[PDB]
Amino acid sequence: QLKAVPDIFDEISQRFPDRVALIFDQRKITYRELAEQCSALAAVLQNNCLIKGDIVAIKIERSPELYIFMLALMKIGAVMVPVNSNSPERYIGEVLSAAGARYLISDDVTSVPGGAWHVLSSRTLIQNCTQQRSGNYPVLSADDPALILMTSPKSVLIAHRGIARLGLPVPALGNSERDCYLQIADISFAASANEIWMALLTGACLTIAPPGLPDLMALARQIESDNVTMLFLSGGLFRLFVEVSVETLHIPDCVVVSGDFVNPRLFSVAVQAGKAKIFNGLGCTENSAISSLYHIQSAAALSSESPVPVGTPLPLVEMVVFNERLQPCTCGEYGELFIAGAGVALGYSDPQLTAERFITIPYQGTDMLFYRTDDRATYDQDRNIVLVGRGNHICKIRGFRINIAGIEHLLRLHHAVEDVLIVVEETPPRLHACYVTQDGLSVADLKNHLAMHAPAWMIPEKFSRLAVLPMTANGKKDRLRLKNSLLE
Numbered sequence: 001q002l003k004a005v006p007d008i009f010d011e012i013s014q015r016f017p018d019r020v021a022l023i024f025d026q027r028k029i030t031y032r033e034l035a036e037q038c039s040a041l042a043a044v045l046q047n048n049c050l051i052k053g054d055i056v057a058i059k060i061e062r063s064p065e066l067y068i069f070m071l072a073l074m075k076i077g078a079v080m081v082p083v084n085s086n087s088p089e090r091y092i093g094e095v096l097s098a099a100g101a102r103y104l105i106s107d108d109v110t111s112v113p114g115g116a117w118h119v120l121s122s123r124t125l126i127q128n129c130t131q132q133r134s135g136n137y138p139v140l141s142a143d144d145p146a147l148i149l150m151t152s153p154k155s156v157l158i159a160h161r162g163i164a165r166l167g168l169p170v171p172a173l174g175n176s177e178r179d180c181y182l183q184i185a186d187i188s189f190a191a192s193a194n195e196i197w198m199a200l201l202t203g204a205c206l207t208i209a210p211p212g213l214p215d216l217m218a219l220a221r222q223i224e225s226d227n228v229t230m231l232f233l234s235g236g237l238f239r240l241f242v243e244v245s246v247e248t249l250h251i252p253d254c255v256v257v258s259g260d261f262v263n264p265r266l267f268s269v270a271v272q273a274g275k276a277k278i279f280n281g282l283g284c285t286e287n288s289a290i291s292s293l294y295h296i297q298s299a300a301a302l303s304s305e306s307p308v309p310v311g312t313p314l315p316l317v318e319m320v321v322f323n324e325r326l327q328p329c330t331c332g333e334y335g336e337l338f339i340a341g342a343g344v345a346l347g348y349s350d351p352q353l354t355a356e357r358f359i360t361i362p363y364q365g366t367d368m369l370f371y372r373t374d375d376r377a378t379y380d381q382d383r384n385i386v387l388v389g390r391g392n393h394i395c396k397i398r399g400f401r402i403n404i405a406g407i408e409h410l411l412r413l414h415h416a417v418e419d420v421l422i423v424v425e426e427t428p429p430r431l432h433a434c435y436v437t438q439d440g441l442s443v444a445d446l447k448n449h450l451a452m453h454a455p456a457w458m459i460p461e462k463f464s465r466l467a468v469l470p471m472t473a474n475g476k477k478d479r480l481r482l483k484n485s486l487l488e
């Protein structure tokens with residue numbers, strides 16, 4: 001069985017004490033300095049009557065102190081709720097309510113709403129970090145709660161094992177203590193665990209991006225300056241790198257694209273641009289962090305009809321596609337993706353919604369707790385998991401369902417289409433496909449292209465062009481912002 005996060009960290013801190021752990025600006029912090037500040041801060045937090053099981057929110061910009069407060073909290077057994085410091089105060093009130101946070105630690109204590117949560121100044125708590133008060137800390141299990149995250153807000157509870165599994169080397173990545181990670185993902189977003197905890201729990205180094213919104217070249221110079229070897233990117237951020245500076249994507253050894261569907265020809269240009277291993281992967285909030293990886297072997301693997309696979313599970317993770325009954329699907333057979341293993345969350349805030357998504361199923365001589373993704377998926381001829389839909393991306397046309405995300409892939413296979421979103425609209429229901437291209441195309445060309453790969457009733461009525469498709473600051477297409485933008 002796994003250990004707790006502070007247990008793995010202390011074992012790493014005494015094994016690689018002189019290796020680099022954090023890099024901010026030009027300053028570097030070793031695992032020994034990080035362990036001392038974490039041990040001192042953990043005793044200070046206990047002297048504020050923060051005990052095991054308490055829910056403490058975190059609102060600190062990208063700083064060396066941000067990750068010390070994380071390691072400090074888990075040590076005392078608290079459950080942290082990270083919130084983006086760039087988020088508006090309306091969203092903070094929702095998250096603090098949905099998480100039931102009893103405390104809040106911040107570097108800007110005034111830009112927050114009032115409520116039942118106590119507000120503490122991280123600028124003050126660091127001042128009281130004496131080298132005297134040593135403290136004594138609880139014994140934590142792998143199933144003890146670690147942090148709380150949100151998803152579109154649903155409140156999700158993550159255990160220690162969900163992020164402690166990242167301390168295991170991934171065979172497809174070949175990571176070790178020699179590597180270096182770039183922390184650019186939002187802390188309130190589960191993809192930041194791929195960067196924070198795969199580094200601090202393996203002896204590797206974590207490069208801290210500037211706070212706020214650094215631009216693309218600010219990240220490109222940093223990947224080259226601090227020699228990042230493991231780069232986790234979102235769909236939109238990966239789209240920008242290929243368009244602008246694709247050469248910077250082959251400085252690291254592995255690049256992992258995750259979070260959303262992406263035009264397959266972006267992977268084709270990315271793999272041809274160098275010899276860095278490019279990955280498509282599945283990340284899920286309810287499975288704590290990154291969950292699967294598919295290595296795009298070459299441009300000849302990029303195919304039509306179906307998008308790029310998400311691959312095979314990470315260590316201590318199990319993923320399987322079930323059909324209309326609980327049994328694995330064959331090749332091509334479409335079903336829903338179920339996930340089990342050390343990454344599965346402890347549940348939602350609603351005990352009934354928890355039971356409607358977490359089910360214990362016997363599988364291979366063992367009762368295993370599965371989470372339902374509501375992602376329609378299938379397999380390829382090599383048992384690589386391939387996503388095709390998401391359940392709420394459907395609609396009835398001529399009495400029969402159609403897959404929204406499936407038509408989007410058939411449209412992206414057109415060489416002129418850069419990207420496309422499709423919207424279900426209300427008429428006395430039809431499809432509206434907003435496309436992007438750089439060369440004037442006719443909407444009859446896109447419809448004629450669709451008829452070669454789709455029946456006549458899987459073709460939208462309206463095609464419109466958007467100078468750009470909206471993003472969510474987490475790198476994925478915002479179908480919500482597009483609909484509200486189409487209300488013009």
Ligand SMILES: Nc1c(O)cccc1C(=O)NS(=O)(=O)NC[C@H]1O[C@@H](n2cnc3c(N)ncnc32)[C@H](O)[C@@H]1O
Pocket residue numbers: 151190191192194257258259260261262280281282283284285286288289290291310373375387390
């Ligand atoms: N990206 C993450 C990460 O790297 C680490 C940890 C967490 C996340 C995260 O995304 N958590 S989340 O916000 O709850 N979203 C979950 C939903 O995203 C969609 N999704 C995810 N990957 C892909 C992909 N390759 N192709 C197409 N669609 C994808 C599916 O529908 C899925 O069910």
